[PDB]
Ligand binder design. Structure first.
Ligand SMILES: Cc1cc(C(C)(C)C)c(O)c(C(C)(C)C)c1
Length: 133
């Protein structure tokens, strides 16, 4: 059910990422470099385990998880969070919890593109990824 998310994806558009990062308390210098970074996201499965890599010139992250099972995560901005990823309405929904705060990272396939919507507080960022051959 996750299979159409799998593969290598490149960022092609971003809206409001600075607002999202600022809401999370990311410092201005980190925001500045992130506003110009074009990450590559790689999503692979092996049985019930998904691995999601985010690679860039700036920061790199990797998580592995089973859908519907909580995992500890250290985010790119060094937040220590409790995470869970679920499929909901065909969307891959990643919820992070820390210090009573929440943020959602929601991925949806629209016309073969991967739309990532990042919400924290009132900030809503939309990032568009396109598949690599
Ligand atoms: C500063 C910064 C913050 C984030 C989140 C806040 C989405 C975790 C992030 O994912 C990245 C890369 C996409 C560059 C890894 C950089």
């Amino acid at each position: 059910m996750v299979d159409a998310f799998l593969g290598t994806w490149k960022l092609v558009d971003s809206k409001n990422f600075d607002d999202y990062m600022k809401s999370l308390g990311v410092g201005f210098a980190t925001r500045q470099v992130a506003s110009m970074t074009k990450p590559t996201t790689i999503i692979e499965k092996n049985g019930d385990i998904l691995t999601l890599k985010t690679h860039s010139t700036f920061k790199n992250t990797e998580i592995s998880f089973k859908l519907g099972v909580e995992f500890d995560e250290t985010t790119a901005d060094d937040r220590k969070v409790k995470s869970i990823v679920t499929l909901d309405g065909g969307k891959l929904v990643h919820l992070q919890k820390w210090d009573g705060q929440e943020t959602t990272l929601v991925r949806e396939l629209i016309d073969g593109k991967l739309i990532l919507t990042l919400t924290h507080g009132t900030a809503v960022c939309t990032r568009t990824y396109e598949k690599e051959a």
